[PDB]
Amino acid sequence: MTVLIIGMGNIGKKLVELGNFEKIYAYDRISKDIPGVVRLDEFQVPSDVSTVVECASPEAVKEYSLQILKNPVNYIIISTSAFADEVFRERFFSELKNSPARVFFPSGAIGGLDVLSSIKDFVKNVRIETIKPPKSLGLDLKGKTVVFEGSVEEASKLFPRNINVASTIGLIVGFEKVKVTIVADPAMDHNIHIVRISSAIGNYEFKIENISMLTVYSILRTLRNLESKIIFG
Amino acid sequence: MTVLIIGMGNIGKKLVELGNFEKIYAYDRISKDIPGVVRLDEFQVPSDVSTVVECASPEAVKEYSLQILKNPVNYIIISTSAFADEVFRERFFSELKNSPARVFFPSGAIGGLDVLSSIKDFVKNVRIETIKPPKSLGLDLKGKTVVFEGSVEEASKLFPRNINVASTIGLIVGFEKVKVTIVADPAMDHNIHIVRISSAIGNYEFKIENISMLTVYSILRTLRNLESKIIFG
Numbered sequence: 297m298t299v300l301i302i303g304m305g306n307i308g309k310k311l312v313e314l315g316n317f318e319k320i321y322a323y324d325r326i327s328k329d330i331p332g333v334v335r336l337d338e339f340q341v342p343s344d345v346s347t348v349v350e351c352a353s354p355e356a357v358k359e360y361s362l363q364i365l366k367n368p369v370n371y372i373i374i375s376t377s378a379f380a381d382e383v384f385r386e387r388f389f390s391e392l393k394n395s396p397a398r399v400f401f402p403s404g405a406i407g408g409l410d411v412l413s414s415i416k417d418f419v420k421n422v423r424i425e426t427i428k429p430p431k432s433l434g435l436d437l438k439g440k441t442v443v444f445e446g447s448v449e450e451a452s453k454l455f456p457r458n459i460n461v462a463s464t465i466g467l468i469v470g471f472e473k474v475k476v477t478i479v480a481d482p483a484m485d486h487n488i489h490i491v492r493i494s495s496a497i498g499n500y501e502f503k504i505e506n507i508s509m510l511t512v513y514s515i516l517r518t519l520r521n522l523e524s525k526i527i528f529g
Numbered sequence: 530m531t532v533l534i535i536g537m538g539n540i541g542k543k544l545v546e547l548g549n550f551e552k553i554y555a556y557d558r559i560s561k562d563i564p565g566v567v568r569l570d571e572f573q574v575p576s577d578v579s580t581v582v583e584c585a586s587p588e589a590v591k592e593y594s595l596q597i598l599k600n601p602v603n604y605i606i607i608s609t610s611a612f613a614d615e616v617f618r619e620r621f622f623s624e625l626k627n628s629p630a631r632v633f634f635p636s637g638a639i640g641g642l643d644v645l646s647s648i649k650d651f652v653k654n655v656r657i658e659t660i661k662p663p664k665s666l667g668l669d670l671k672g673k674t675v676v677f678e679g680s681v682e683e684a685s686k687l688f689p690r691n692i693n694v695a696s697t698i699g700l701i702v703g704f705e706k707v708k709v710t711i712v713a714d715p716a717m718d719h720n721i722h723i724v725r726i727s728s729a730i731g732n733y734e735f736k737i738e739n740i741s742m743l744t745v746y747s748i749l750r751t752l753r754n755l756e757s758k759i760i761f762g
């Protein structure tokens with residue numbers, strides 16, 4: 297299929313090298329030498345694009361979402377942190393009911409969204425804890441320390457970085473039901489995600505220790521799935 | 530859409546009551562009073578069926594898989610334990626390459642299959658441990674005891690019950706890479722599933738404590754997804 301990739305950062309260039317595409321349109325405010333892509337200069341959704349993939353920034357999701365939705369394409373979004381904004385979220389799904397498009401929210405850096413999606417109406421609450429090494433926060437500590445705790449909306453305001461995982465989760469069960477905790481642990485070599493889910497159907501715990509590659513393959517699997525006979529999860 | 534549900538056990542009757550369907554064809558060796566379904570007597574795939582759902586038994590998967598695949602429908606399978614059979618597995622995906630159909634393997638009683646599907650080529654091994662209460666095995670114990678450990682193929686031969694979770698997993702990463710452990714813990718009130726995944730991309734831990742309802746909603750979410758604009762995981 298022909299596709300439009302928004303953003304040529306670590307994830308964009310990676311999709312271009314691993315993906316199998318006849319044609320690739322790419323838009324990125326910068327202008328680095330483009331390899332096997334048709335670097336656009338003015339954003340737009342070419343008529344032969346069957347799928348659009350956003351992997352730029354929350355602001356990009358907000359800037360083009362409206363236009364993208366006019367077109368009858370599969371719309372893959374990863375910068376979900378943008379949905380932590382009540383006003384933008386309302387606007388988006390409005391355009392979507394009228395839209396001929398289809399939106400896909402791949403799990404990204406976490407997993408367990410298959411069951412969380414199935415039992416979403418029954419979820420009582422979701423606790424997502426991120427444990428980063430002190431170094432990655434310019435901190436020197438002798439023990440674990442909570443650097444933040446509250447809603448997804450607030451977490452995004454102070455951490456314009458991640459807060460994408462929690463947002464996709466919020467988009468599934470409702471934001472009011474998600475609590476975010478960011479912990480700095482001097483004993484931690486790498487980043488970790490722990491998703492604790494309480495519901496009327498059962499309780500689930502998902503621990504993620506990524507050694508972001510996971511998100512890349514998460515996108516690829518979604519694209520591959522569009523054209524596959526064997527679908528898992 | 531019009532659908533064909535194979536098996537009217539706990540899961541079949543549940544799909545009939547919660548599902549939203551214009552027409553339902555149902556086949557079940559028994560003959561209990563059927564409510565809102567068109568109880569067939571001779572198995573077959575009516576021409577107006579757009580989706581078939583198996584939730585009967587592994588033997589059923591093996592008996593009708595061949596026929597189902599001739600038809601251009603979405604084929605949902607849950608009794609995956611049947612794929613632990615090397616010979617049947619080879620036969621199935623053979624028919625599928627030639628098939629106009631599409632197969633869906635919902636996560637069922639576990640979760641985390643979204644990430645496991647994305648990073649499947651990189652998986653080094655998967656350990657799935659099931660911790661049941663001694664009572665559910667007619668055992669009286671004073672401490673945890675392993676009642677079984679080995680491959681998915683063997684687990685199915687001694688436990689014609691579950692071994693479906695491990696099979697779907699085997700279908701994803703390859704059976705040789707899955708190790709199954711069934712533990713009886715006197716301290717355990719309910720059943721638990723722990724899926725430990727080791728790979729080149731990272732390590733994942735999924736703990737599942739279901740209070741099977743999860744599988745039902747897992748099927749429903751797959752059906753709902755066929756006709757939805759918002760897809761998660």
Ligand SMILES: NC(=O)c1ccc[n+]([C@@H]2O[C@H](COP(=O)([O-])OP(=O)(O)OC[C@H]3O[C@@H](n4cnc5c(N)ncnc54)[C@H](O)[C@@H]3O)[C@@H](O)[C@H]2O)c1
Nearest residue numbers: 303305306307324325352353354356374375404405460511
């Ligand atoms: N959902 C998840 O699990 C998950 C995980 C990791 C990253 N992400 C998201 O992916 C994004 C980062 O991707 P990356 O790793 O390639 O980072 P990156 O910063 O290396 O790449 C971003 C690229 O997009 C371009 N860009 C920024 N705004 C743009 C805009 N408004 N319009 C067009 N182009 C724009 C930038 O010039 C940059 O080259 C982040 O926004 C993050 O939220 C999501």
Ligand SMILES: NC(=O)c1ccc[n+]([C@@H]2O[C@H](COP(=O)([O-])OP(=O)(O)OC[C@H]3O[C@@H](n4cnc5c(N)ncnc54)[C@H](O)[C@@H]3O)[C@@H](O)[C@H]2O)c1
Nearest residue numbers: 536538539540557558585586587589607608637638693744
């Ligand atoms: N993948 C998962 O996570 C998962 C989880 C739970 C159960 N399951 C599967 O679901 C099945 C059980 O479903 P249930 O909970 O409704 O159980 P059940 O035993 O109550 O229902 C099974 C029904 O299917 C009928 N049946 C059996 N063989 C048939 C055949 N060959 N052809 C036509 N009909 C047949 C039976 O008469 C019975 O009424 C099991 O085979 C199990 O492997 C999968």
